[PDB]
Structure formats: structure tokens, C-alpha cells
């Protein structure tokens, strides 16, 4: 069987470069020749306890694009958990008895963890658990970074926006820190700063990272500019000074931009990026979005198929 077979993809901390590399490979493979019937007969649950456009929709297309059938929900408000005071665990307890895999997004952290405790044999895929992880996001990210840069080692990577609450940057910093010679520049409001525990990891790994007070000076030496919206919904009222984006990026800012540099964004964006950028070629967030199919597919493929995909 393949390494990720019947495995729970919960946090990026539990994956290896080999793991990462494998999904990628398989993504690039399926992107070339699709396997429309690879997962027929399978039924996957799309459980969203939290809001999503991209993550939920891209995942469901993936499942259909592989002959799999889909059941689940976009809102817990109509679940017995929603209206009958059920517990998430019991929820997962019954659901594990129906389907072959569980994709879930949830407002609190370690929610996916929790679920594996009751999921049984049925593998659990975290579509985002609070401020914590967002692994499937990372995978499309990496796929995109590699698409446009040719490598995942030795990059100049600038992460702007909300990093304290950005599950997106939580995972992905962990992910390229598994690669070598990666320069991390961090531009964040002092309260939406990056959490200690991610920096330490960087320290011990000897990976270099340096705070910055503006996009202006990182802008000449960066391959990747990962922009993030301020996680407004997870904000504490004592942080509501920071609800408006400190760092907005317009086309003007990109003159000095390396010709190879791309702008990335988990999406969605509110004002941290101006539509003029949309015209320019460093802009890659919509292509970035399109890549989620492939990664999610690859992943699905691997987790559900023992024998390494043809």
C-alpha cells in the first residue's frame, strides 16, 4: 500500500517531505491524465461546521471528478448536533458507520483530532480547524509554489497579514520548514503576529526568518508573497484595532518585483489586495485556487487507494 493509505490527514506536523512530495507527484499525475472512475462506489462525507466556498466546493468536485458520490452538509444548524444538542463525537460516531471518508471544517481547534478518536477505520480529513491547521490548503499552495518556481527549497517567502489566527500560514510555514534554505519574511500587525511555537520550530531547524514592517523592503528579494485576510471572525474585541488591513498591496508596489515572483492568497481577500494586481502577472491567487482540485484529488486518491495510483 501507499504511505498515506487509510491515513488521517489532520495536521501538517504529522507529514513528511516524502508525504508532501508524494501528494504533489500524484497531483501532477492526475492533472495530466484524470481517472474519472478511480473512486466510484465510494461515498465521502462533506461536513462543514464552518463556512467555506473554495475548500468545500473544490473538494466535492474532486470527489465527483473521481466517480465518488458525496453526502454531508454546509451548515450544522440543521444537524441533530445543530438542533438536538448532540455531541460532535457522537456525531462522528454515527457518521463513521456510513461513509468511507470524512472531510470536516470546524470552528474550533483539534476538532479533526477529536474526530479520529471516534471516526474508527474511516480516515478524517481536516478542511480547517480553527486557527490550527489547513493541510489541504497547504498542499495546493506547495503545488502552486512549485508550479511557478520549479522548487520548494531555497525560496524567499513573505507572509503578510494575519498570522496569529491564520491556519493557512500555520501549516504552510511548517511545510516549507521541511525543506532546505527557505527564507521566511514575516510582515504582521504586532498582535496578529506569528505564534511562538512556529518560530521555535524554525529556530531549532536553523531556518532563517525575520520580521519586517512593510512589504516595501522584502519586495525585491522574494519569490513568493503569501497574502492573508485578517481572520476577523476569530478576533478578540481587544484586537479589533487590527480588523482593518494594515498592509494593502497594489500594482504600484510591484515594480521592483522579481520577474519570477508571484502573489499568493488562500482566499478570500477583502482589501489587502487591490484589483489592479489582478491584471499584473505576479498575481496567481486565482490560478492558486484552481490547483486545489488536483491536490485534493491526489490526496483523496492516495488516502482511499491502497495500491499507488496509475
Amino acid at each position: 500500500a501507499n504511505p498515506l493509505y487509510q491515513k488521517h490527514i489532520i495536521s501538517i506536523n504529522d507529514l513528511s517531505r516524502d508525504d508532501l512530495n508524494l501528494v504533489l507527484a500524484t497531483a501532477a499525475k492526475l492533472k495530466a491524465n484524470p481517472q474519472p472512475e478511480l473512486l466510484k462506489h465510494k461515498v465521502i462525507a462533506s461536513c462543514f461546521f464552518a463556512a467555506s466556498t473554495r475548500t468545500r466546493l473544490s473538494f466535492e468536485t474532486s470527489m465527483h471528478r473521481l466517480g465518488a458520490s458525496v453526502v454531508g452538509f454546509s451548515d450544522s444548524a440543521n444537524t441533530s448536533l445543530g438542533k438536538k444538542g448532540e455531541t460532535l463525537a457522537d456525531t462522528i460516531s454515527v457518521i463513521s458507520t456510513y461513509v468511507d471518508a470524512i472531510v470536516m471544517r470546524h470552528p474550533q481547534e483539534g476538532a479533526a483530532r477529536l474526530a479520529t478518536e471516534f471516526s474508527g477505520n474511516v480516515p478524517v480529513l481536516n478542511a480547517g480547524d480553527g486557527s490550527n491547521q489547513h493541510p489541504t490548503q497547504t498542499l495546493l499552495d506547495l503545488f502552486t509554489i512549485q508550479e511557478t518556481q520549479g522548487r520548494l527549497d531555497n525560496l524567499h517567502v513573505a507572509m503578510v497579514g494575519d498570522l496569529k489566527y491564520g491556519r493557512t500560514v500555520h501549516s504552510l510555514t511548517q511545510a516549507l520548514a521541511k525543506f532546505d534554505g527557505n527564507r521566511f519574511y514575516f510582515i504582521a500587525p504586532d498582535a496578529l503576529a506569528m505564534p511562538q511555537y512556529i518560530l521555535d520550530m524554525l529556530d531549532e531547524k536553523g531556518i532563517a526568518w525575520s520580521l519586517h514592517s512593510s512589504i516595501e523592503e522584502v519586495m525585491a528579494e522574494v519569490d513568493i508573497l503569501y497574502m492573508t485576510r485578517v481572520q476577523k471572525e476569530r478576533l478578540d474585541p481587544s484586537e479589533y484595532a487590527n480588523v482593518k488591513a494594515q498592509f494593502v498591496l497594489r500594482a504600484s508596489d510591484l515594480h521592483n518585483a522579481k520577474a519570477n515572483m508571484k502573489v499568493l492568497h488562500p482566499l478570500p481577500r477583502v482589501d489587502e489586495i487591490a484589483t489592479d494586481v489582478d491584471k499584473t502577472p505576479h498575481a496567481w491567487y486565482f490560478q492558486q485556487a484552481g490547483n486545489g482540485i488536483f491536490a485534493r484529488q491526489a490526496l483523496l486518491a492516495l488516502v482511499l487507494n491502497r495500491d499507488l495510483v496509475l
Partner: protein, 153 residues
Amino acid sequence: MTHDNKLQVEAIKRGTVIDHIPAQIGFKLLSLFKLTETDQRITIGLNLPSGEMGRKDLIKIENTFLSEDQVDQLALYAPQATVNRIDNYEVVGKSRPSLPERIDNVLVCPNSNCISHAEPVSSSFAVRKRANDIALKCKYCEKEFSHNVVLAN
């Protein structure tokens, strides 16, 4: 086997002996690992000066036997203390609280949006030698915290 100055039959045929507990730490421990929720003859000595330790708390239970795990856990509040496996009145083994892998049930994740609160599951942190102290990583939320700021049930 207690030495000189007056009397003290704080020594039994069977039981365990938590020697050398840093003062004040005594009380806590009794609650935390709930060592009083037994019915065996316990005897606790608070702040009793000795020598080596100017003032050392100290606990002993009759007929009760600490687990290598249960023991280790004390390495967070008194890693420099000594357990004594007292059998037939004589010391069968002298142990010390050594730092453990992780501390399941008796530690509440300080993270409010942690799922470990709402749902019925046992708390759990991985333990780590940060710099001048231990670091605690919630099994769930994946947030890690000082062993000084984390609170316990």
C-alpha cells in the same frame, strides 16, 4: 527508617514514600493526582525542616504503590524528589521523578477555542524541555504553553 530528634512512626510495612518535596508543593500534589482519594493510612508532613532541604514537604501512603507513569508526573512539580518502594518495612527501590512523554487527564488546555472543553475527552499535552522550563502542547489545538501558565483540573 527516620533518624534522630524525638519520635515519629512515619514509617510503615507497606506503602510509598515521597521524600524531598519542595515546600508548599506538598499540598498541590495531594489534590492534583488526587492522592487523598484513597482510604489507606496516609501521613503527610508539611514544611518539616530536615537538613539537606531546609524545609521539605513530604508524603507517604500505606499499602499504596506508585506507577512508573504516575511517578514521572511529579517531575513537573518536584523532579528532585525521591520515591521509596517500601515493602516489609525495608526500601526495595529508590526512584526519582523523570520527565515524561505527555500528561494525559489532569491538565486543562488554556486555549478557550480548544475542542477539549466542549466534548468529553481526556486532556493531553506533550511535555518538552523548552529552555529554563517545560513546554506543554495540547494534543488537540496544537498550541504549546509553559508548564507555569497551563492550569490543571
